[PDB]
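quick one, twelve chains, predict together pls
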Amino acid sequence: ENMTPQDYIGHHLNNLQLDLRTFSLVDPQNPPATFWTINIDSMFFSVVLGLLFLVLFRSVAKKATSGVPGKFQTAIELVIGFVNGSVKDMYHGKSKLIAPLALTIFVWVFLMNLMDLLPIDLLPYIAEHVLGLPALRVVPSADVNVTLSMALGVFILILFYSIKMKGIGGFTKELTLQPFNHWAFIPVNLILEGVSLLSKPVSLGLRLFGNMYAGELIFILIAGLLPWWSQWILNVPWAIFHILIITLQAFIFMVLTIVYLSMASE
Amino acid sequence: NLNMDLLYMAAAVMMGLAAIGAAIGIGILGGKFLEGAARQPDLIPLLRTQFFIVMGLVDAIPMIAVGLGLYVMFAVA
Amino acid sequence: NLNMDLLYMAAAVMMGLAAIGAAIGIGILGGKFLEGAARQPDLIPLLRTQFFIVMGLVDAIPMIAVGLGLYVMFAVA
Amino acid sequence: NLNMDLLYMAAAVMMGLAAIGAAIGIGILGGKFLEGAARQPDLIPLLRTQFFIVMGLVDAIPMIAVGLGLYVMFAVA
Amino acid sequence: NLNMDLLYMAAAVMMGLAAIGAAIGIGILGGKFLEGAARQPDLIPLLRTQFFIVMGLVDAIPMIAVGLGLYVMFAVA
Amino acid sequence: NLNMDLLYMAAAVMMGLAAIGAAIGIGILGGKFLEGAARQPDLIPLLRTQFFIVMGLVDAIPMIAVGLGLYVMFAVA
Amino acid sequence: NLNMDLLYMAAAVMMGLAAIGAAIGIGILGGKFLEGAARQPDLIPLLRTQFFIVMGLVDAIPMIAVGLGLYVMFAVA
Amino acid sequence: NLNMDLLYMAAAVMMGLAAIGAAIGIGILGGKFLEGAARQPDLIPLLRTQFFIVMGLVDAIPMIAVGLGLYVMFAVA
Amino acid sequence: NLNMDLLYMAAAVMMGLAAIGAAIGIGILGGKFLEGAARQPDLIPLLRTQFFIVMGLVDAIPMIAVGLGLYVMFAVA
Amino acid sequence: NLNMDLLYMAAAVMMGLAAIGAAIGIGILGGKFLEGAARQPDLIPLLRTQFFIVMGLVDAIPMIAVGLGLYVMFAVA
Amino acid sequence: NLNMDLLYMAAAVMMGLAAIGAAIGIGILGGKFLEGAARQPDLIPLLRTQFFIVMGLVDAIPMIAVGLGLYVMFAV
Amino acid sequence: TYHLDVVSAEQQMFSGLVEKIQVTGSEGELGIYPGHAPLLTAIKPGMIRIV
């Protein structure tokens, strides 16, 4: 085969975008400049992972008994206990929303990141040849949108909690007075509070996207540049690292969401 | 053309400086927080609150600097 | 071509230096405040109030630097 | 000529400064974490969880520069 | 007339270096001031006077630099 | 054309900064590890595991920078 | 003409380096002085005398640089 | 002609930064090792083993930098 | 012509670096003396004389730099 | 003439960076050695031997940089 | 003539970096020397010897840098 | 030189002027010389040796 590694890298960094208006498959060679072209590859893998999570959790919840626990049920009981313990550590309120939200965030983000461990070309080669799709990339987390949509939803939840539990009066009071509490600093206080408030979810989403993106691109470079006989000696030491990376990043997303919600509410 | 091309370098300089300053300051702050939580383990949720309070102060200037660099590299460029 | 571009370059270097200085100074001040909080947790309401006053002096100069950088970027263009 | 290489140099500046800041800040944090773990070898999970909080806070902002540099390199240049 | 553009950069570098120096110096001084207030909380009004006396010296050169850069930026340019 | 020379310089800067950070942060971390291992010589296998745990976090961004510098040097230039 | 553009930049660099070094040195010295004054009150005048003695030595080369940058700016350019 | 000349500066910056990073990291690690050996002279063979274990991680990136600097200086020239 | 324009810049950068180094080194030397005098005043004159001894060596190279900058600025022009 | 005027700067960068790195690393190592010899005066010959052992490791690369800079300056001209 | 100002600039860079290193490393060393004298006031003559021994190593490269700066400045 | 006392709750073990001593401090072996700054530390079991 004849290919320039630059273009091999180019294809992998492209997405099966499809026009919402005309229902037309975009191609990687020429990107149009229209806003409403959903990037299908990340979203298609992303909801599939959520479906798998929901299916497994229901398939265990539908039978679990307080008797002798099975080997399969034990992993789900352990993850439920871990999430519940983290929530009880960093949340004391009565809101039933917090714990399932954190559980969903943790499991879904872990599932999305796990896709990166797979061989980079397997699913894209399958989609191109067997199906015929112009482009494909299978790690959902590497999408900025998936990260930013989740972060903005968490920010919306933070605003709701500040308005409701913390109070709109208790929100204007904090924004105006704190941290300097004097009217001379109140204009400065508003700017500082707004900047930090918007910094938090942007930090969450862009941290997750940076981790996943900079692992996927490393895998793509390793695949594209090195000869086959030498790839393993640098690919294997990286996947072992990225397992810890994805675990840590899902844990960080869950715990930081918990922290932000608890600080907004209480 | 060179006029817009150099703007990318200007934004690069600005946001790199912002990132180094923020990373080092937050690292020092977190190191002090970890040592404090290691001296008094029962006190961790208070120190963590204080750490968030001061971290909201630290990042504001690096955050706005990075935001303005993003502005210069996207809206301007 | 290169007049506005260099204006943006000057604003970039100015704001980067300001962000570096603010981040480092507030990091040091907050680390020492955290240590003083750790030593005597019940004194935190007073030490935090003094830290806020000192941090205002810390913030005083990077804010005029950032304001002049924003002026250069937006107004002078 | 002036188009591509200046973009490459800008990306290099971004992702050298981000590496400097993130590495130094994470080393600073990990030093205090490892010092705490030697004092209280039992409390290690709690201290490492707090370390994870601070490590995420530190790592958040350099990754902005890292991702934007990758963008500048490949999408732009 | 290219003369104008270089003067803005000359003001920007001066003011950025002044901001870095003054913010780091004031943070270093205030950190020891806060630790001393943590140790002997009754002495705080005396340590505040001493801190102001010392701070009046730290900002000697930085305020001259900031004034001269502001002069260059407006009166000369 | 002359454009090829600047790519080497940009890769040089990026990799040099990446090596500066990857060396200094790892040095600080290892110094703390050795200091903690001197105290409790029986805890070396645990401290050594945690040292690896944090050290993986340290060098990641330097590894990204080094890989991008290798790419720029060989594949692009 | 060409003279003033480079002369203002040279004076700016000189005064900025002076403001960096003087501020950092005075910050460190004042931090140690404040820590000693917090350690042993009622010796504040003696420690202040010694601190002034040292400070007179510290600012010397920074004051020479400040004076020569003023000379360049307001005599040469 | 610049294709030959500029490559020596691109290697000079790499072999300066790699040397600064390796020297600072090895100095800090060796200082901690020396202090630990001074406090606990019996453990010197163990602390030396752990020091040599850790030091091979510090040199990992600076040695890539120095080898690539030699390559850039000699092979491509 | 360009000659004086570049020579003033060379003198400025050299003297600025010399001032930074001398000021920071003298500040550290003075801070250690301040802590040693805070610990026990009965040794103040002895430490103060050794401080003069060491400070004599401190200014060795900075004053060579200052003299050669003065020469460049005033006799080479 | 045109060719030779730039090799002296290639020597200058390598030798300045090598001098800074070697001097600072040797200063850190000597400071720790002096600390250890101040704690236990009787171990001074053993500590001196260990310091001389480590110092050769410290200044290996800086000596390569100084050697190649002298080679450039006095054989490449 | 045209490259002379550049010769002076390179000499100034060398002599600035050499002064930076020779100041900071000797300051770091002298801080520990002062603290060790403040602990062991009798051993001061003993410690001064070791201080001079290591100071001989510290100045080694800054003096090469200063001599080459002087050569570039005045001897070419 | 300094005056060394070695005592216990039950008995005085030794008293006399001493030029230098070797003693195992809490964190490591320690040597004491005349004019030493005030110092406080526990001592681990073992030999203390005196001149």
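Residues 2-39 of chain D form the longest helix (38 residues).
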